Amino acid sequence: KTVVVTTILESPYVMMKKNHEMLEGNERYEGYCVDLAAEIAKHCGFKYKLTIVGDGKYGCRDADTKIWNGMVGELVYGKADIAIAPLTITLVREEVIDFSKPFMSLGISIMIKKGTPIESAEDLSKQTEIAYGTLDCGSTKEFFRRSKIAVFDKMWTYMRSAEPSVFVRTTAEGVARVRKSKGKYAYLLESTMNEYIEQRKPCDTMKVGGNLDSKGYGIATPKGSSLGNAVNLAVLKLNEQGLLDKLKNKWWYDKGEC
Amino acid sequence: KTVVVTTILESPYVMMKKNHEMLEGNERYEGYCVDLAAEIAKHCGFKYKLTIVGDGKYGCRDADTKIWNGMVGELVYGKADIAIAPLTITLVREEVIDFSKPFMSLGISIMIKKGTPIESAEDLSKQTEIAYGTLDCGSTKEFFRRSKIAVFDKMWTYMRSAEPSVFVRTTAEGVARVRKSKGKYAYLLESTMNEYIEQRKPCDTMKVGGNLDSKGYGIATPKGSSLGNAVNLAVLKLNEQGLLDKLKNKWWYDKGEC
Ligand SMILES: N#Cc1cc2c(cc1[N+](=O)[O-])=NC(=O)C(=O)N=2
Ligand SMILES: N#Cc1cc2c(cc1[N+](=O)[O-])=NC(=O)C(=O)N=2
Ligand SMILES: [Zn+2]
Ligand SMILES: [Zn+2]
Ligand SMILES: [Zn+2]
Ligand SMILES: [Zn+2]
């Protein structure tokens, strides 16, 4: 029986091979999570088919209709058996699906255009000439809004009333805003994506400072799945075999461009 | 029913209060995990009794007898209901007990006496003047023995044959060796202990370099325990509330001496 794996097109986790039009099935795709899927399936002993999430989303529950979208929806509504993607482990998600132990750690972090005189959140917080913001909705925004920490309160107090708005609609919009702003905008985002972009042409951005919080990506299965136990032990084995680190190094650095 | 928590006297997770002999029950103890225990109990709705693990061990399985010792033992054989301690989440442990998602991240790291001209594992690998080692058995030693990575393979080749022995019997012996060796011994250990010791008098050690691997500590319950789900969700909630970070800062930095 063929396990249906849902994943999402986010580089470098899953990307179309250059010659994808010539290929078929699992072979059309490459990247960190493709490699991970193959390892998980090999060590759990199953055959699988990769499919890209229909709506291109991770997974959130509409307040209005209480319906789950993205990969979480595909699990909860039975369109796929397992999600192998950079899906963040969160309380609201783990209420409806099961997560493996994290396969990759991450945190909120600062992206600057190279040259910008900022090396930390504290630096940002003490000034206003360099503008800075986050996605207009989602966990990073909420992290600042709720923080009782002085530096983060200060940054919230600033971002919430800044004009023009410092919030962006998509991550890509945030990255492009850093790149076209002539050193006048810094963007706050997942450190994994920040370090990824640091190694992409034209090599004009940089990750600075320590992570502001700590989070994990996990592989997700539905409650009571026959796969959940073995998938979890698999993630642990891969980590101890140094394979997760190998995959990270490969996709971020060996294929780096800077 | 009063939940029996097993834990271990490892600073700053669990320590005797200075006036412990005037006190009784849970109140004798303080530390990160004591605070954490209170929070977990409150969010899962149980009363508990902190007990120090009989043998002072974390838990491994004896190769000959196959018997688990330490806190893992107490969980496996039915002596305690939950382990709230810096118990590392590992493949062989997760095969026999359940863990929450990690409450704290760590990795193998390098402890040096201040002034030692070493900034990374690479730096250590390329020289011989400064000796370096790990605990004489256990996971840090095994990480080097099994590594396919060039830098770590080189360090292993050196450590395994170094004379006199670079391995030590206890964490304490490792730290004392760095302190009395005038810069000629560096010790490889968990990053959390490393960073803790850096804030303790006489303030003569430092953690240097990035972590060499990545692991997490998790709260453990016996397989099929009915506490397991609630405890996991409670760990996620505390992270998202900033409470675990607040506790870390508190016990490592607010109470630091350097
Ligand atoms: N950028 C960005 C991202 C945004 C994300 C994400 C991963 C990434 N990522 O590392 O590309 N996982 C999620 O579960 C999520 O709700 N939102
Ligand atoms: N040193 C030391 C340590 C050694 C440890 C540990 C925690 C710590 N710690 O940071 O105190 N947890 C474990 O599960 C373990 O097998 N060995
Ligand atoms: Zn095409
Ligand atoms: Zn493998
Ligand atoms: Zn005493
Ligand atoms: Zn609380």
UniProtKB/Swiss-Prot annotation, chains A, B:
Changing L91Y: Promotes dimerization. Strongly reduced desensitization. Palmitoylated. Depalmitoylated upon L-glutamate stimulation. Ubiquitinated by RNF167, leading to its degradation. Induction: Down-regulated in the pyramidal cell layer of CA1 in the hippocampus by global ischemia. The modification Phosphoserine is found at S147, S181. It is found in: Cell membrane; Postsynaptic cell membrane; Postsynaptic density membrane. L-glutamate binds at P86, T88, R93, S139, T140, E190. GO terms for molecular function: AMPA glutamate receptor activity; amyloid-beta binding; cytoskeletal protein binding; extracellular ligand-gated monoatomic ion channel activity; extracellularly glutamate-gated ion channel activity; glutamate receptor binding; glutamate-gated calcium ion channel activity; glutamate-gated receptor activity. Disulfide bonds join C203-C258. One of its GO terms (biological process) is modulation of chemical synaptic transmission. The record marks I118 as: Crucial to convey clamshell closure to channel opening. The record marks R61, R145, K237 as: Interaction with the cone snail toxin Con-ikot-ikot. Ionotropic glutamate receptor that functions as a ligand-gated cation channel, gated by L-glutamate and glutamatergic agonists such as alpha-amino-3-hydroxy-5-methyl-4-isoxazolepropionic acid (AMPA), quisqualic acid, and kainic acid. L-glutamate acts as an excitatory neurotransmitter at many synapses in the central nervous system and plays an important role in fast excitatory synaptic transmission. The postsynaptic actions of L-glutamate are mediated by a variety of receptors that are named according to their selective agonists. This receptor binds AMPA (quisqualate) > L-glutamate > kainate. This is Glutamate receptor 2. The gene is Gria2.
